[PDB]
């Protein structure tokens, strides 16, 4: 398929995977822990979401040492997944500056080439003429 | 009338609609659910706010399967609405430099035009001379 959907859908697929992993890891890692209600996968499914989008509603979350290492990794994964998609939108914004800067080197380079070239010509004409003022007049 | 307010106001309108939809869907979808206080629209109105701005105070939120699908859609919609306004702040600050750099093109361009066209004025001059030197010295 179109690549812009392959690099965009990828970060989207990699996003889901981690939004399904933290809800897969921070669940079984929350069994037998003080204040560990996050013992269900479907409930942790929403857990990794509020973790990625860094919302932290505060109703479902870990309390273990290993269940927190997986949580922080879901926090950073979110910032990464959206920090890249935001700087990618800039490619289409500052990328229209390229087309504005490139549509500029044209008009400016065009204005020159004429000036110059119309000068090389100014010489030939000027050259032959003089040249015609010679040999011919004499012979 | 304008094209930057129609594309900006559009994402602004599309924003409100979804900010009015989640508070319209996640409300009736939160009736008869464990810990479902989000049964009111005005309370769910603030709900979609903390969801978009990803603050998640944790006092008003869904617990259903369909009420959460609408919630995550409001989470992403927020990031998208502010991630664009941010990349738009860059193109606006980087695009302004293209104007001052485009003016830099005026000083570097129009200066070269007038010069290469001041030499042309000369090129002939010297030619003119030589022409005379002959026609004035020979015939």
């Amino acid at each position, epitope marked *: 398929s179109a690549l812009h959907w392959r690099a965009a859908g990828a970060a989207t697929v990699l996003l889901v995977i981690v939004l399904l992993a933290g809800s897969y890891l921070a669940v079984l890692a929350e069994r037998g822990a003080p204040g560990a209600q996050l013992i269900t996968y479907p409930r942790a499914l929403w857990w990794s979401v509020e973790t990625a989008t860094t919302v932290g509603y505060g109703d479902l979350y870990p309390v273990t040492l290993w269940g927190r290492l997986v949580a922080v990794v879901v926090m950073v994964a979110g910032i990464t997944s959206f920090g890249l998609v935001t700087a990618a939108l800039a490619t289409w914004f500052v990328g229209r500056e390229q087309e504005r800067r490139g549509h500029f080197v044209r008009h400016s380079e065009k204005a020159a080439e004429e000036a110059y070239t119309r000068t090389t010509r100014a010489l030939h004409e000027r050259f*032959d003429r003089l040249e015609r003022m010679l040999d011919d007049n004499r012979r | 009338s304008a094209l930057h307010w129609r594309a900006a106001g559009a994402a602004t309108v599309l924003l409100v609609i979804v900010l009015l939809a989640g508070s319209y869907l996640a409300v009736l979808a939160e009736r008869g659910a464990p810990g479902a206080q989000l049964i009111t629209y005005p309370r769910a109105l603030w709900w979609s706010v903390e969801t978009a701005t990803t603050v998640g105070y944790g006092d008003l939120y869904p617990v259903t399967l369909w009420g959460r699908l609408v919630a995550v859609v409001v989470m992403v919609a927020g990031i998208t609405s502010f991630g664009l306004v941010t990349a738009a702040l860059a193109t606006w600050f980087v695009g302004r430099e293209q104007e001052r750099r485009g003016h830099f093109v005026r000083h570097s361009e129009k200066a070269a035009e007038e010069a290469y066209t001041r030499t042309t004025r000369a090129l002939h001059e010297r030619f003119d001379r030589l022409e005379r030197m002959l026609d004035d010295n020979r015939r």
Partner: antibody, heavy 124, light 110 residues
Framework: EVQLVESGGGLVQPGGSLRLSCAASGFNISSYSIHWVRQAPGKGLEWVASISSYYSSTYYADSVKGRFTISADTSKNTAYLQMNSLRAEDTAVYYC?????????????????WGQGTLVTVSS | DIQMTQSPSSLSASVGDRVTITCRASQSVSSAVAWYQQKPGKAPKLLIYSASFLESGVPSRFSGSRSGTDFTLTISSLQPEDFATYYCQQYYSYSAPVTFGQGTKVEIKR
């Protein structure tokens, strides 16, 4: 067989504009230069422009300047005169004629092959 | 720019006669003049180029001579039809280059 075919002449409301064409026939305008010489109604001879399409150059007499715009097209083989902002006095018999470019002994025979001219007749 | 002064304003004479017209360049014109004959109705006809030689296929009674700045066209033994309107042209300037003289009309007298 070399020849020229001025065309486009006619009547124009004082102020209006016209476009004359000088289709070449025997020579390649390219390596040549075309002249637009006009002649008042019954008066004498006056030249208006010239354009050595070889050296990408154009020329105009003073009697005209911010108005006429000589220009040729070598894709086809014709020289055109774009007479703009025509003035009552501009009416006449616009002929167009040759002269070789600045090249080997040819530039010396003046306008060696004149055309037959058209008649731009401006008037309200 | 170079202008042109041409005499005689209007010339009258019969056949056999010898006609001589003059033209003085308001400026240096390195033998860059040409001689034109325009019979009312048609367009000019090149007679003399370089001010010296004559366009291939022209009557022998035709010629020109350069006087530094003064140019003169002479018709030896004026024929019957050689009557027309004669034009003096300078083609030197680089105000590309054609500038015609007011002209001299030679009307055959009888």
């Amino acid at each position: 067989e070399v020849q020229l075919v001025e065309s486009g002449g006619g009547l124009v409301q004082p102020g209006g504009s016209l476009r004359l064409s000088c289709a070449a026939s025997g020579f390649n305008i390219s390596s040549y230069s075309i002249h637009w010489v006009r002649q008042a109604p019954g008066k004498g001879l006056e030249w208006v422009a010239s354009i050595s399409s070889y050296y990408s150059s154009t020329y105009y007499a003073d009697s005209v300047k911010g108005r006429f715009t000589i220009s040729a097209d070598t894709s086809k083989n014709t020289a055109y005169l774009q007479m703009n902002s025509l003035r009552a006095e501009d009416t006449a018999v616009y002929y167009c004629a040759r002269q070789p470019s600045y090249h080997m002994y040819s530039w010396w025979v003046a306008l060696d092959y004149w055309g037959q001219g058209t008649l731009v007749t401006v008037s309200s | 720019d170079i202008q042109m002064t041409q005499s005689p304003s209007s010339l009258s004479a019969s056949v056999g006669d010898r006609v001589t017209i003059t033209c003085r360049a308001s400026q240096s014109v390195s033998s860059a003049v040409a001689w034109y004959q325009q019979k009312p109705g048609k367009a000019p006809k090149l007679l003399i180029y370089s001010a010296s030689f004559l366009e291939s296929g022209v009557p022998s009674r035709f010629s020109g001579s350069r006087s530094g700045t003064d140019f003169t066209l002479t018709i030896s033994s004026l024929q019957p039809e050689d009557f027309a309107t004669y034009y003096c042209q300078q083609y030197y300037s680089y105000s590309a280059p054609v500038t015609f003289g007011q002209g001299t009309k030679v009307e055959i007298k009888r």
